[PDB]
Amino acid sequence: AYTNSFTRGVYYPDKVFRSSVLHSTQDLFLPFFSNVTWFHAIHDNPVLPFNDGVYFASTEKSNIIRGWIFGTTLDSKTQSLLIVNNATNVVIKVCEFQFCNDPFLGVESEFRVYSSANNCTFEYVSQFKNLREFVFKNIDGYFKIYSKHTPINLVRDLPQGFSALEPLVDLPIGINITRFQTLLALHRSYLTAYYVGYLQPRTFLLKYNENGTITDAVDCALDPLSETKCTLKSFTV
Amino acid sequence: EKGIYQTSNFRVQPTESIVRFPNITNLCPFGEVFNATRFASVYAWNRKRISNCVADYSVLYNSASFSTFKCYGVSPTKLNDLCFTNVYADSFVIRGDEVRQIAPGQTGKIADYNYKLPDDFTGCVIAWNSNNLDSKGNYNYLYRLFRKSNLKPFERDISTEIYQAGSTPCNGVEGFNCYFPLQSYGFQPTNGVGYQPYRVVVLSFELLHAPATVCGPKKSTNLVKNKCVNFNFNGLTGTGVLTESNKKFLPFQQFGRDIADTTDAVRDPQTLEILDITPCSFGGVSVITPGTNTSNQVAVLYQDVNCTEVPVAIHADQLTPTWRVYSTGSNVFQTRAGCLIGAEHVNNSYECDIPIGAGICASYQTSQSIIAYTMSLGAENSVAYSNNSIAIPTNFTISVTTEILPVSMTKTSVDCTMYICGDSTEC
Amino acid sequence: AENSVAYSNNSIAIPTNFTISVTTEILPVSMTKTSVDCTMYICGDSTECSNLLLQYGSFCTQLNRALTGIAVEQDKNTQEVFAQVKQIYKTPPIKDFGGFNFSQILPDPSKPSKRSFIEDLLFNKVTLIKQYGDCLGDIAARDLICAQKFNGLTVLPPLLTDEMIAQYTSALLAGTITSGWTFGAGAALQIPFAMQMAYRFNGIGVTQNVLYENQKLIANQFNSAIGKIQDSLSSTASALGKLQDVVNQNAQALNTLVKQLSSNFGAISSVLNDILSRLDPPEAEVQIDRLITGRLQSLQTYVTQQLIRAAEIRASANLAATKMSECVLGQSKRVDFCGKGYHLMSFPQSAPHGVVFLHVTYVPAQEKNFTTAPAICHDGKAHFPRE
């Protein structure tokens, strides 16, 4: 399955306040009107690649989506990463896990994700009208995360307007990531709705308003009209 | 010569210095970093977070043991004046003759397999000899000898797998051209220099962008608004005037920038209010003179300045007393070109002599003084038009007048090599 | 459009009527006078930077001399176009002028200003001090003009005000309507306006009885064409594109110069205070020299392009001075120099940075075919027409 992004995964690229200007930025972004893969539970979690960074969105009503694992082999030969919510706090952990071949969390119920957890270098702890959007990047021994939540007005399709993602957390983990897998909350514990887009090296043209808010953008490689607007540094031609 | 001259600029000078650091009083645990019993091996290097402290950096480089204190994006003399963001500390032990590999842009089995620094590194690299502490025999200081590829910057590779250095896939145990990747160090107390162990600490931080929790020993002052001060907010220096803003900063933002990339807004680090920054007032100064043949009197125009703001517009009683008479007085005249000081405004109109702008000219008249007036366009005249009257001339004048035009200019030539290089064949 | 002339060797076409035509011509005269504080552009308030800037010589003395030479020439351009007569002729009371109605181009006599109705319409159609003065409210003072002033870039006012330029144009209009071309050659000699118009008909090769017999029709055609000018300026968009272009190019060049201050030119930062906060002067000097070299190059590019634009503005103002002398102060025989058709007379009107000419011409209208001959033989002698 596939859907259409239209405007998804624009984040604040730095930490400086800017009001009522235009600004041109090279980063890793999600290109406009690209195909995002669809996963639903009409009544499945494979090992998706990472490759340069990931857009992640998810929507349910009552707390099914909870966390991810990131790594290379997932076979306790190399280090790996883990993020889980408790519906109270969040647990982040960089041990040398031997992962199960089908990780999930039983409904309070126990953990069926890792058997062995040795050799830990990092640990951390923290705290349809819900669309939760995420961007993950892995640059220079850091793991950056951007996020924003909005009430979806719709049934199945992604909304049409514009909203920018604020930065959340930056983690010094020092590992090599090539694959990842999301973690669900399964009722019947069988030891055997969310969107994924990929980030590309682009150039964007960001508009800041009177109040400092990013309200519009232009993907300079979308079409010839936007390639014109990026050369003229304005939004009307 | 007689005329009007843009000569210099006036500029208000700052009065006092302002420092606004955050209020943090607990000192910073560098003893737990630098005085530890056991450092880590270089393949599995330790990263310690440093936060919410006051760090004095001078007692590090003003001490004895360190034979390497190399800072990269910053000078060591400046470290006690800045505030830092995302401070981390990295500690390991290497051999004595590969301290030179801990730098941006290095090759060798430490820099290629074990610990890589980025090209745009900001921080300091500290190293010192630990023969007394880590030599006897000693063999549990390992380094990596074999990897399939080169490391990324700030990557740690803690994994054990037999290194296939041939074309046949081995498993589990040592074989021919199959190798255990890690290797010990032979630290003996009678080794030569180059084989003796060295303890290494790497500090890494970010400067002057985000909010800050780690900074050195400066005492704050109190915040002074509405006048030209000399500020220092978290290590960011500058001159200007501080007033209250009404922009709203998101909690991950400390500064604002304008179109020329200069700082024009700042959140205070003790109060969390938003202030605006603006330079202290300046402007151009034109001097109206007659010839120095004729006089030494002058008048002074302060271009695009209101007249009640000219001692606010200059740094009032810092100038020479020979200068400060040209900021007050009774010869003070408001024009649309600025404030004119030192000429008397009269009510006549004359043909223009020295142009000032927006209809005003100046002259030297009878004793002698400098006057300012509105220029006249010419003599008023009225034609006696009627619907059956004509005027015919009855005489004439033969008139001869001159007209001068330029035709040509001087022809010049340049020997380029003689201008640039002289006689020098090296040049 | 394709067309074909019915040429023959004994056919001629003569016109039987005519049209009085009024057209508009717009010329630029002057541009904005600007000045640059070099040390404030390059170095800010840093005394370390301003001591390093002395190693490059007299570059900023040279740049300020070039800009001052442009600014003086802009006042010479305006003097040369508008100040050609030195008597200020007063506006007469408008009740005669043979039926010709001049009320929309003469200054409004109950109002105390000197602008006419058409000059008001022209001054409301170009979208162009104390906004250097405020610049401290610091939220509403995020204009483009406060960003220019804070980095040492200022605008100087013109020597003649707009009110003075309108006084010059109304003195020229009064001299023309009461005296014809005599006030351009000497003292003004009064003549009635229909006798002036008869002698101008005589200048284009039409006998003056044609004017006197068609006087009311000629005055009605003139008053209608003036009304068409007025409502075409009340209903259009871009008639004054030539004057709007000078304003736009100047504002674009200053905004480009302000945006060049955020290039680092190969240094670690584009902000001088960041470099001075993090490094000590022996390795700060290497970065500051790179920034100095980049910003000096930006200023030199700006000044070279201002000098080339000032040379083209100067050629345009020389042409407007020649047209004032030859179409307002005389009647012209040069084909198409004062409009299309046979020139009768011209009127000037001031405009922002410019001048508008209203040209009045005779255009022949309703032609007939006749048979013609070169000479006539009467008594064995050839006879030729005199006129």
Add this chain to the structure above:
Amino acid sequence: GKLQDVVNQNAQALNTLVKQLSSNFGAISSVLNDILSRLDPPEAEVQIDRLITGRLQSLQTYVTQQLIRAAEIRASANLAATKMSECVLGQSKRVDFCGKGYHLMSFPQSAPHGVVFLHVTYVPAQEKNFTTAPAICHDGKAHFPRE
């Protein structure tokens, strides 16, 4: 003054170019011989490249401003050639092109780097008021003056 300005601007430009040779442009000296007396070629190259770059920029500025001044002098010479043709070799009807008044004749005189024209004109002097009329009616017919 119009002829003295052309002499003054060009002497000023050459004097500015000569005294730009005492800037060091970020080198240790502005004197090439002092640089070559104290250093050997591998680190003398670094200082000499700075001096070369600065002096090249000075020469380029001088030449660009000469080309713009030459274009203005060319327009002035074109106007003087037109005035020689139309005021000395003919009588002109263009208002104010050959002096103020009605043009009779003009005389040329040579000048350093330039030309001076002496324009002779007729200016009317002593005027009288009269009563005028457009036409005259004689026998039920209108009469108009010829000249």
